[PDB]
Scaffold this active site. Structure first.
Site, mmCIF file in Angstrom:
data_model
loop_
_atom_site.group_PDB
_atom_site.id
_atom_site.type_symbol
_atom_site.label_atom_id
_atom_site.label_comp_id
_atom_site.label_asym_id
_atom_site.label_seq_id
_atom_site.Cartn_x
_atom_site.Cartn_y
_atom_site.Cartn_z
ATOM 1 N N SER A 10 0.816 -1.252 0.000
ATOM 2 C CA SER A 10 0.000 0.000 0.000
ATOM 3 C C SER A 10 0.842 1.293 0.000
ATOM 4 C CB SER A 10 -1.143 -0.020 0.983
ATOM 5 O OG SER A 10 -2.234 0.748 0.518
ATOM 6 N N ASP A 25 -0.502 -5.328 -3.337
ATOM 7 C CA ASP A 25 -1.928 -4.932 -3.405
ATOM 8 C C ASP A 25 -2.059 -3.412 -3.483
ATOM 9 O OD1 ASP A 25 -4.395 -6.601 -3.519
ATOM 10 O OD2 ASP A 25 -5.015 -5.345 -1.821
ATOM 11 N N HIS A 80 -6.021 -7.489 1.658
ATOM 12 C CA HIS A 80 -5.128 -6.380 1.253
ATOM 13 C C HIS A 80 -3.738 -6.670 1.822
ATOM 14 C CE1 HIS A 80 -3.976 -2.446 -0.061
ATOM 15 N NE2 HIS A 80 -4.029 -1.871 1.155
HETATM 16 CL CL LIG Z 1 -1.986 2.601 2.998
#
Ligand SMILES: [Cl-]
Length: 291
Positions: free
Chosen positions: A117, A141, A272
């Site tokens: 992320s 992801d 995630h």
């Molecule tokens: Cl994040």
């Protein structure tokens, strides 16, 4: 539970989650100014790992223990033991500006950067500004567009939180664990408990707080796509099969803009946080990238 437990006390749990046996690797905390990191396997890291928003370096413990490679797992600004910022600016662009001179000191020979992320986008900005360092990117992801979409959804709830007083305050460890169970109730509580342990600290009050600053804001994604166009480092993407965070359109856009897209690995039964939900599958992929 009174806890003066050392931050390396639970590593045997990480070795078991990774499905490896034998002596634990050497690890220690390092710091250069505003940036703290975990340095694994001595002083010549092969891989740099950058965690996500609301995470810290310890997110990588299982992956790093399973991979058995010397590694540097960095606390992003606003996270782990890395200094907060009054402006609440943990943008990839700023993170990258703080991190680059530290990575030049602590991990000059690490070709490979793995980022999840916010850490993934930070990795892109690093690859852009300091190529001599980044040979190869693994994104977990995330794409620029995927994080932009997430930032836009949470904008109202990051405007409101900002107007409250103090950080939050928690009566017990269990109260923070209860919140983490609520967000991922299907996940093994011993894993969740380990994550909360690293991500939290007890005050002298006897109360507890999160280690991370509540993220007020993020960065300039058009500039971030310009960085993907200019980058020479190959990009591998790892998606969670149960994560809607990155769409098929997101992946095709990254393929189109990247100089060398190596493809997406879709990890079955991962959300995630692939390093949290399916670390064994993430170790195989990362091992694949080290050839
Ligand atoms: Cl994040």
């Amino acid at each position: 539970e009174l806890t003066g437990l050392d931050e390396f006390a639970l590593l045997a749990e990480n070795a078991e989650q990774a499905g490896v046996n034998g002596p634990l690797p050497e690890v220690e905390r390092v710091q250069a100014g505003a940036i703290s990191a975990l340095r694994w396997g001595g002083s010549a890291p092969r891989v740099i790992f950058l965690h996500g928003g609301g995470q810290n370096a310890h997110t990588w413990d299982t992956v790093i223990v399973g991979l058995g490679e010397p590694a540097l797992a960095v606390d992003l600004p606003g996270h782990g033991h890395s200094a907060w910022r009054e402006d609440g600016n943990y943008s990839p662009q700023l993170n990258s500006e703080t991190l680059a001179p530290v990575l030049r000191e602590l991990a000059p020979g690490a070709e490979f950067v793995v980022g999840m992320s916010l850490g993934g986008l930070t990795a892109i900005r690093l690859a852009a500004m300091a190529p001599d360092l980044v040979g190869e990117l693994v994104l977990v992801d995330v794409t620029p567009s995927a994080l932009q979409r997430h930032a836009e959804l949470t904008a109202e709830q990051r405007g409101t939180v900002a107007l409250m007083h103090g950080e939050r305050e928690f009566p017990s460890f269990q109260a923070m664990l209860d919140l983490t169970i609520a967000a991922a109730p299907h996940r093994d509580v011993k894993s969740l408990r380990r994550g909360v342990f690293h991500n939290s600290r007890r005050l002298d009050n006897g109360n507890w707080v999160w280690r991370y600053d509540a993220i007020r804001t993020f960065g300039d994604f058009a500039g971030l796509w310009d960085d993907v166009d200019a980058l020479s480092a190959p990009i591998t993407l790892v998606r969670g099969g149960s994560s809607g965070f990155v769409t098929d359109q997101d992946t095709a856009e990254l393929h189109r803009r990247a100089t060398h897209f190596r493809g997406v690995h879709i990890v079955e039964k991962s959300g995630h946080s692939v390093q949290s939900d399916q670390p064994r599958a993430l170790i195989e992929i990362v091992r694949g990238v080290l050839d």
